[PDB]
JSON list of C-alpha atoms and ligand atoms in Angstrom, two decimals:
[
{"chain": "A", "resi": 1, "resn": "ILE", "atom": "CA", "xyz": [-0.25, 0.46, -0.19]},
{"chain": "A", "resi": 2, "resn": "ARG", "atom": "CA", "xyz": [1.57, 3.27, -1.41]},
{"chain": "A", "resi": 3, "resn": "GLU", "atom": "CA", "xyz": [1.29, 6.72, -0.99]},
{"chain": "A", "resi": 4, "resn": "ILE", "atom": "CA", "xyz": [-1.12, 7.65, -4.44]},
{"chain": "A", "resi": 5, "resn": "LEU", "atom": "CA", "xyz": [0.24, 11.17, -5.19]},
{"chain": "A", "resi": 6, "resn": "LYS", "atom": "CA", "xyz": [-2.04, 14.51, -5.23]},
{"chain": "A", "resi": 7, "resn": "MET", "atom": "CA", "xyz": [-2.22, 17.14, -8.07]},
{"chain": "A", "resi": 8, "resn": "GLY", "atom": "CA", "xyz": [0.04, 20.28, -7.80]},
{"chain": "A", "resi": 9, "resn": "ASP", "atom": "CA", "xyz": [2.99, 17.18, -7.08]},
{"chain": "A", "resi": 10, "resn": "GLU", "atom": "CA", "xyz": [5.34, 17.41, -9.67]},
{"chain": "A", "resi": 11, "resn": "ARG", "atom": "CA", "xyz": [6.17, 14.63, -10.10]},
{"chain": "A", "resi": 12, "resn": "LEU", "atom": "CA", "xyz": [2.71, 13.52, -12.18]},
{"chain": "A", "resi": 13, "resn": "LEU", "atom": "CA", "xyz": [4.17, 16.38, -14.75]},
{"chain": "A", "resi": 14, "resn": "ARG", "atom": "CA", "xyz": [6.55, 13.96, -15.77]},
{"chain": "A", "resi": 15, "resn": "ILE", "atom": "CA", "xyz": [6.65, 12.22, -19.30]},
{"chain": "A", "resi": 16, "resn": "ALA", "atom": "CA", "xyz": [7.39, 8.32, -18.11]},
{"chain": "A", "resi": 17, "resn": "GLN", "atom": "CA", "xyz": [9.93, 6.40, -18.69]},
{"chain": "A", "resi": 18, "resn": "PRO", "atom": "CA", "xyz": [9.51, 2.68, -20.96]},
{"chain": "A", "resi": 19, "resn": "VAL", "atom": "CA", "xyz": [9.53, -0.34, -18.42]},
{"chain": "A", "resi": 20, "resn": "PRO", "atom": "CA", "xyz": [13.24, -1.83, -20.06]},
{"chain": "A", "resi": 21, "resn": "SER", "atom": "CA", "xyz": [12.86, -4.71, -21.13]},
{"chain": "A", "resi": 22, "resn": "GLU", "atom": "CA", "xyz": [15.78, -6.08, -18.89]},
{"chain": "A", "resi": 23, "resn": "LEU", "atom": "CA", "xyz": [12.73, -5.48, -16.08]},
{"chain": "A", "resi": 24, "resn": "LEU", "atom": "CA", "xyz": [10.11, -7.88, -18.14]},
{"chain": "A", "resi": 25, "resn": "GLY", "atom": "CA", "xyz": [9.32, -11.04, -16.31]},
{"chain": "A", "resi": 26, "resn": "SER", "atom": "CA", "xyz": [11.07, -9.90, -13.13]},
{"chain": "A", "resi": 27, "resn": "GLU", "atom": "CA", "xyz": [10.22, -10.39, -9.86]},
{"chain": "A", "resi": 28, "resn": "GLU", "atom": "CA", "xyz": [10.40, -6.24, -8.76]},
{"chain": "A", "resi": 29, "resn": "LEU", "atom": "CA", "xyz": [8.37, -5.07, -12.01]},
{"chain": "A", "resi": 30, "resn": "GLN", "atom": "CA", "xyz": [5.54, -8.47, -10.14]},
{"chain": "A", "resi": 31, "resn": "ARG", "atom": "CA", "xyz": [6.17, -6.89, -7.20]},
{"chain": "A", "resi": 32, "resn": "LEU", "atom": "CA", "xyz": [5.68, -3.01, -8.47]},
{"chain": "A", "resi": 33, "resn": "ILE", "atom": "CA", "xyz": [2.66, -4.32, -10.59]},
{"chain": "A", "resi": 34, "resn": "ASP", "atom": "CA", "xyz": [1.18, -6.62, -6.92]},
{"chain": "A", "resi": 35, "resn": "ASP", "atom": "CA", "xyz": [1.43, -3.16, -4.48]},
{"chain": "A", "resi": 36, "resn": "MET", "atom": "CA", "xyz": [-0.27, -1.63, -7.56]},
{"chain": "A", "resi": 37, "resn": "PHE", "atom": "CA", "xyz": [-3.65, -3.36, -6.92]},
{"chain": "A", "resi": 38, "resn": "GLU", "atom": "CA", "xyz": [-3.16, -3.42, -3.85]},
{"chain": "A", "resi": 39, "resn": "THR", "atom": "CA", "xyz": [-3.29, 0.29, -3.59]},
{"chain": "A", "resi": 40, "resn": "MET", "atom": "CA", "xyz": [-5.78, 0.77, -6.33]},
{"chain": "A", "resi": 41, "resn": "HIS", "atom": "CA", "xyz": [-7.31, -2.12, -4.94]},
{"chain": "A", "resi": 42, "resn": "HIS", "atom": "CA", "xyz": [-7.87, -0.19, -0.81]},
{"chain": "A", "resi": 43, "resn": "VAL", "atom": "CA", "xyz": [-8.56, 3.16, -2.33]},
{"chain": "A", "resi": 44, "resn": "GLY", "atom": "CA", "xyz": [-11.46, 1.88, -3.96]},
{"chain": "A", "resi": 45, "resn": "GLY", "atom": "CA", "xyz": [-9.72, 3.27, -7.83]},
{"chain": "A", "resi": 46, "resn": "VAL", "atom": "CA", "xyz": [-10.83, 1.44, -11.54]},
{"chain": "A", "resi": 47, "resn": "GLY", "atom": "CA", "xyz": [-6.85, 3.03, -12.23]},
{"chain": "A", "resi": 48, "resn": "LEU", "atom": "CA", "xyz": [-4.26, 3.83, -11.37]},
{"chain": "A", "resi": 49, "resn": "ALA", "atom": "CA", "xyz": [-0.40, 4.20, -13.43]},
{"chain": "A", "resi": 50, "resn": "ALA", "atom": "CA", "xyz": [2.96, 4.10, -11.79]},
{"chain": "A", "resi": 51, "resn": "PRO", "atom": "CA", "xyz": [3.59, 7.98, -11.51]},
{"chain": "A", "resi": 52, "resn": "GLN", "atom": "CA", "xyz": [0.48, 8.53, -8.98]},
{"chain": "A", "resi": 53, "resn": "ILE", "atom": "CA", "xyz": [2.62, 6.55, -6.41]},
{"chain": "A", "resi": 54, "resn": "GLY", "atom": "CA", "xyz": [6.39, 8.40, -7.70]},
{"chain": "A", "resi": 55, "resn": "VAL", "atom": "CA", "xyz": [7.40, 5.09, -9.59]},
{"chain": "A", "resi": 56, "resn": "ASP", "atom": "CA", "xyz": [8.45, 6.55, -13.05]},
{"chain": "A", "resi": 57, "resn": "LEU", "atom": "CA", "xyz": [7.89, 4.36, -15.38]},
{"chain": "A", "resi": 58, "resn": "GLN", "atom": "CA", "xyz": [4.92, 3.90, -18.11]},
{"chain": "A", "resi": 59, "resn": "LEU", "atom": "CA", "xyz": [3.40, 1.38, -16.88]},
{"chain": "A", "resi": 60, "resn": "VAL", "atom": "CA", "xyz": [-0.63, 1.42, -15.43]},
{"chain": "A", "resi": 61, "resn": "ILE", "atom": "CA", "xyz": [-3.97, -0.92, -14.65]},
{"chain": "A", "resi": 62, "resn": "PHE", "atom": "CA", "xyz": [-6.95, -0.91, -14.64]},
{"chain": "A", "resi": 63, "resn": "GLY", "atom": "CA", "xyz": [-10.19, -3.26, -14.40]},
{"chain": "A", "resi": 64, "resn": "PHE", "atom": "CA", "xyz": [-13.81, -2.54, -12.58]},
{"chain": "A", "resi": 65, "resn": "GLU", "atom": "CA", "xyz": [-16.07, -5.80, -12.48]},
{"chain": "A", "resi": 74, "resn": "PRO", "atom": "CA", "xyz": [-19.93, -1.36, -17.78]},
{"chain": "A", "resi": 75, "resn": "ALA", "atom": "CA", "xyz": [-17.09, -3.88, -17.33]},
{"chain": "A", "resi": 76, "resn": "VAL", "atom": "CA", "xyz": [-13.71, -3.52, -17.74]},
{"chain": "A", "resi": 77, "resn": "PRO", "atom": "CA", "xyz": [-10.96, -6.61, -17.64]},
{"chain": "A", "resi": 78, "resn": "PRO", "atom": "CA", "xyz": [-8.53, -6.12, -15.27]},
{"chain": "A", "resi": 79, "resn": "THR", "atom": "CA", "xyz": [-5.58, -5.24, -17.44]},
{"chain": "A", "resi": 80, "resn": "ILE", "atom": "CA", "xyz": [-1.34, -4.47, -16.95]},
{"chain": "A", "resi": 81, "resn": "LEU", "atom": "CA", "xyz": [-0.35, -2.25, -19.60]},
{"chain": "A", "resi": 82, "resn": "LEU", "atom": "CA", "xyz": [3.33, -1.74, -20.07]},
{"chain": "A", "resi": 83, "resn": "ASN", "atom": "CA", "xyz": [4.99, 1.34, -22.64]},
{"chain": "A", "resi": 84, "resn": "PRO", "atom": "CA", "xyz": [1.61, 1.82, -24.16]},
{"chain": "A", "resi": 85, "resn": "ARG", "atom": "CA", "xyz": [0.69, 3.50, -27.80]},
{"chain": "A", "resi": 86, "resn": "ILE", "atom": "CA", "xyz": [-3.31, 4.83, -28.12]},
{"chain": "A", "resi": 87, "resn": "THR", "atom": "CA", "xyz": [-4.72, 4.98, -31.86]},
{"chain": "A", "resi": 88, "resn": "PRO", "atom": "CA", "xyz": [-7.73, 6.57, -32.11]},
{"chain": "A", "resi": 89, "resn": "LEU", "atom": "CA", "xyz": [-10.00, 4.53, -34.25]},
{"chain": "A", "resi": 90, "resn": "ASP", "atom": "CA", "xyz": [-12.56, 8.08, -35.78]},
{"chain": "A", "resi": 91, "resn": "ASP", "atom": "CA", "xyz": [-12.53, 11.71, -34.85]},
{"chain": "A", "resi": 92, "resn": "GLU", "atom": "CA", "xyz": [-15.64, 10.79, -33.15]},
{"chain": "A", "resi": 93, "resn": "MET", "atom": "CA", "xyz": [-15.92, 11.76, -29.68]},
{"chain": "A", "resi": 94, "resn": "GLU", "atom": "CA", "xyz": [-17.73, 11.33, -26.37]},
{"chain": "A", "resi": 95, "resn": "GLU", "atom": "CA", "xyz": [-17.72, 13.56, -22.98]},
{"chain": "A", "resi": 96, "resn": "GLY", "atom": "CA", "xyz": [-18.43, 11.53, -19.54]},
{"chain": "A", "resi": 97, "resn": "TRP", "atom": "CA", "xyz": [-17.72, 12.17, -16.27]},
{"chain": "A", "resi": 98, "resn": "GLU", "atom": "CA", "xyz": [-14.00, 10.95, -14.56]},
{"chain": "A", "resi": 99, "resn": "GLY", "atom": "CA", "xyz": [-12.49, 11.67, -11.00]},
{"chain": "A", "resi": 100, "resn": "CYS", "atom": "CA", "xyz": [-9.19, 10.39, -10.27]},
{"chain": "A", "resi": 101, "resn": "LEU", "atom": "CA", "xyz": [-7.44, 9.12, -6.69]},
{"chain": "A", "resi": 102, "resn": "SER", "atom": "CA", "xyz": [-4.65, 12.26, -7.35]},
{"chain": "A", "resi": 103, "resn": "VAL", "atom": "CA", "xyz": [-7.19, 14.51, -7.77]},
{"chain": "A", "resi": 104, "resn": "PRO", "atom": "CA", "xyz": [-9.27, 13.34, -4.75]},
{"chain": "A", "resi": 105, "resn": "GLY", "atom": "CA", "xyz": [-12.90, 14.79, -3.56]},
{"chain": "A", "resi": 106, "resn": "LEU", "atom": "CA", "xyz": [-13.37, 16.32, -7.40]},
{"chain": "A", "resi": 107, "resn": "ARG", "atom": "CA", "xyz": [-15.42, 15.29, -10.40]},
{"chain": "A", "resi": 108, "resn": "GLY", "atom": "CA", "xyz": [-14.86, 16.53, -14.40]},
{"chain": "A", "resi": 109, "resn": "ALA", "atom": "CA", "xyz": [-16.32, 15.82, -16.78]},
{"chain": "A", "resi": 110, "resn": "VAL", "atom": "CA", "xyz": [-14.29, 15.15, -20.18]},
{"chain": "A", "resi": 111, "resn": "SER", "atom": "CA", "xyz": [-14.55, 14.97, -23.84]},
{"chain": "A", "resi": 112, "resn": "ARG", "atom": "CA", "xyz": [-11.98, 11.80, -25.29]},
{"chain": "A", "resi": 113, "resn": "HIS", "atom": "CA", "xyz": [-12.14, 9.17, -28.12]},
{"chain": "A", "resi": 114, "resn": "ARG", "atom": "CA", "xyz": [-15.29, 7.07, -28.61]},
{"chain": "A", "resi": 115, "resn": "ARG", "atom": "CA", "xyz": [-12.96, 4.17, -29.73]},
{"chain": "A", "resi": 116, "resn": "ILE", "atom": "CA", "xyz": [-9.34, 3.15, -29.88]},
{"chain": "A", "resi": 117, "resn": "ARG", "atom": "CA", "xyz": [-7.24, 1.18, -30.30]},
{"chain": "A", "resi": 118, "resn": "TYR", "atom": "CA", "xyz": [-4.42, 0.82, -27.90]},
{"chain": "A", "resi": 119, "resn": "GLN", "atom": "CA", "xyz": [-1.06, -1.15, -27.61]},
{"chain": "A", "resi": 120, "resn": "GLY", "atom": "CA", "xyz": [1.84, -2.31, -25.13]},
{"chain": "A", "resi": 121, "resn": "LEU", "atom": "CA", "xyz": [3.59, -5.11, -23.09]},
{"chain": "A", "resi": 122, "resn": "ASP", "atom": "CA", "xyz": [2.03, -7.06, -21.05]},
{"chain": "A", "resi": 123, "resn": "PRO", "atom": "CA", "xyz": [4.30, -7.46, -17.82]},
{"chain": "A", "resi": 124, "resn": "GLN", "atom": "CA", "xyz": [5.74, -10.24, -20.04]},
{"chain": "A", "resi": 125, "resn": "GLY", "atom": "CA", "xyz": [6.79, -9.00, -22.57]},
{"chain": "A", "resi": 126, "resn": "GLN", "atom": "CA", "xyz": [4.28, -10.16, -24.98]},
{"chain": "A", "resi": 127, "resn": "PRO", "atom": "CA", "xyz": [2.06, -8.03, -27.38]},
{"chain": "A", "resi": 128, "resn": "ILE", "atom": "CA", "xyz": [-1.02, -5.94, -26.86]},
{"chain": "A", "resi": 129, "resn": "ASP", "atom": "CA", "xyz": [-3.56, -4.94, -28.85]},
{"chain": "A", "resi": 130, "resn": "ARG", "atom": "CA", "xyz": [-6.74, -4.59, -28.51]},
{"chain": "A", "resi": 131, "resn": "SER", "atom": "CA", "xyz": [-9.48, -2.25, -30.22]},
{"chain": "A", "resi": 132, "resn": "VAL", "atom": "CA", "xyz": [-12.47, -0.70, -27.58]},
{"chain": "A", "resi": 133, "resn": "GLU", "atom": "CA", "xyz": [-14.57, 1.48, -27.54]},
{"chain": "A", "resi": 134, "resn": "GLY", "atom": "CA", "xyz": [-17.26, 3.76, -23.98]},
{"chain": "A", "resi": 135, "resn": "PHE", "atom": "CA", "xyz": [-15.49, 3.16, -20.83]},
{"chain": "A", "resi": 136, "resn": "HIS", "atom": "CA", "xyz": [-12.84, 0.61, -21.71]},
{"chain": "A", "resi": 137, "resn": "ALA", "atom": "CA", "xyz": [-12.10, 3.14, -24.35]},
{"chain": "A", "resi": 138, "resn": "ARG", "atom": "CA", "xyz": [-11.83, 5.93, -21.86]},
{"chain": "A", "resi": 139, "resn": "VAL", "atom": "CA", "xyz": [-10.61, 4.44, -18.78]},
{"chain": "A", "resi": 140, "resn": "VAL", "atom": "CA", "xyz": [-7.95, 3.68, -20.93]},
{"chain": "A", "resi": 141, "resn": "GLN", "atom": "CA", "xyz": [-7.02, 7.05, -22.37]},
{"chain": "A", "resi": 142, "resn": "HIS", "atom": "CA", "xyz": [-7.28, 8.60, -18.68]},
{"chain": "A", "resi": 143, "resn": "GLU", "atom": "CA", "xyz": [-4.77, 6.37, -17.48]},
{"chain": "A", "resi": 144, "resn": "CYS", "atom": "CA", "xyz": [-2.07, 6.82, -20.39]},
{"chain": "A", "resi": 145, "resn": "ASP", "atom": "CA", "xyz": [-3.03, 10.56, -19.94]},
{"chain": "A", "resi": 146, "resn": "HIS", "atom": "CA", "xyz": [-0.39, 10.53, -16.42]},
{"chain": "A", "resi": 147, "resn": "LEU", "atom": "CA", "xyz": [2.00, 8.87, -18.38]},
{"chain": "A", "resi": 148, "resn": "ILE", "atom": "CA", "xyz": [2.28, 12.79, -20.24]},
{"chain": "A", "resi": 149, "resn": "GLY", "atom": "CA", "xyz": [1.71, 14.12, -16.72]},
{"chain": "A", "resi": 150, "resn": "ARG", "atom": "CA", "xyz": [-2.00, 15.09, -17.71]},
{"chain": "A", "resi": 151, "resn": "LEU", "atom": "CA", "xyz": [-4.85, 15.35, -14.86]},
{"chain": "A", "resi": 152, "resn": "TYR", "atom": "CA", "xyz": [-8.48, 15.61, -16.03]},
{"chain": "A", "resi": 153, "resn": "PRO", "atom": "CA", "xyz": [-8.65, 19.52, -15.35]},
{"chain": "A", "resi": 154, "resn": "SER", "atom": "CA", "xyz": [-6.06, 19.95, -18.23]},
{"chain": "A", "resi": 155, "resn": "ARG", "atom": "CA", "xyz": [-8.39, 18.06, -20.96]},
{"chain": "A", "resi": 156, "resn": "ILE", "atom": "CA", "xyz": [-11.81, 20.22, -19.64]},
{"chain": "A", "resi": 157, "resn": "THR", "atom": "CA", "xyz": [-13.07, 21.72, -21.46]},
{"chain": "A", "resi": 158, "resn": "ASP", "atom": "CA", "xyz": [-16.35, 22.74, -19.82]},
{"chain": "A", "resi": 159, "resn": "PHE", "atom": "CA", "xyz": [-15.61, 23.90, -16.34]},
{"chain": "A", "resi": 160, "resn": "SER", "atom": "CA", "xyz": [-19.73, 24.75, -15.66]},
{"chain": "A", "resi": 161, "resn": "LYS", "atom": "CA", "xyz": [-19.06, 20.52, -15.11]},
{"chain": "A", "resi": 162, "resn": "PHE", "atom": "CA", "xyz": [-16.62, 20.50, -12.61]},
{"chain": "A", "resi": 163, "resn": "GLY", "atom": "CA", "xyz": [-17.04, 20.19, -9.53]},
{"chain": "A", "resi": 164, "resn": "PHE", "atom": "CA", "xyz": [-17.03, 18.77, -5.61]},
{"chain": "A", "resi": 165, "resn": "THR", "atom": "CA", "xyz": [-18.68, 15.64, -6.06]},
{"chain": "A", "resi": 166, "resn": "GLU", "atom": "CA", "xyz": [-20.82, 15.47, -2.97]},
{"chain": "A", "resi": 167, "resn": "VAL", "atom": "CA", "xyz": [-21.91, 18.93, -4.78]},
{"chain": "A", "resi": 168, "resn": "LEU", "atom": "CA", "xyz": [-22.18, 17.10, -8.64]},
{"chain": "B", "resi": 201, "resn": "NI", "atom": "NI1", "xyz": [17.78, -1.85, -22.44]},
{"chain": "B", "resi": 202, "resn": "NI", "atom": "NI1", "xyz": [-11.45, -5.45, -1.11]},
{"chain": "B", "resi": 203, "resn": "NI", "atom": "NI1", "xyz": [-6.50, 9.59, -13.04]}
]
């Protein structure tokens, strides 16, 4: 169980380093992944990026039992499948107490590596697509407030 960094912390602004291929399949990468699951799960989040716990790596996890498969994604690359955008409510453990509506691509392809270096290549839409965009934003130093285009839909969760 690891401390989730909060918006304002300069570490969330980094462009994360790729996971080195030497670390694929290692116990250390395993431990990091397990800590991330334990951390995400303890605070009840749908996703977590390694930078939010202060680890400078292109690694994210996400899962929701609109269900989304439990996934561990390294060194990702996202490709929008079209121009259709869709607004949805988002929150984030690094921005506690808030929700905001954010416009994302409705459908994406994502690629990357699983923790053993096996290739991942999925096309997905709706919520799954949103989660993946949201978590990969952490790897380029972006939190969702920086993606809001309608500020009337940004506020405290209990107020909204
Ligand atoms: Ni290398
Ligand atoms: Ni539990
Ligand atoms: Ni987040």
